[PDB]
Amino acid sequence: IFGAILPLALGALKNLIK
């Protein structure tokens, strides 16, 4: 759940900034 959504988004972020 949140412990899976929060981390996922945390990565998507890296996929945005790089």
**Distance between CA atoms of 18 and 4, rounded to whole angstroms?**
21
**Distance between CA atoms of 6 and 18, rounded to whole angstroms?**
18
Q: State the SS3 of the chain.
A: CHHHHHHHHHHHHHHHHC
**16's tokens:** 């945005």
Tell me how the structure was determined: NMR
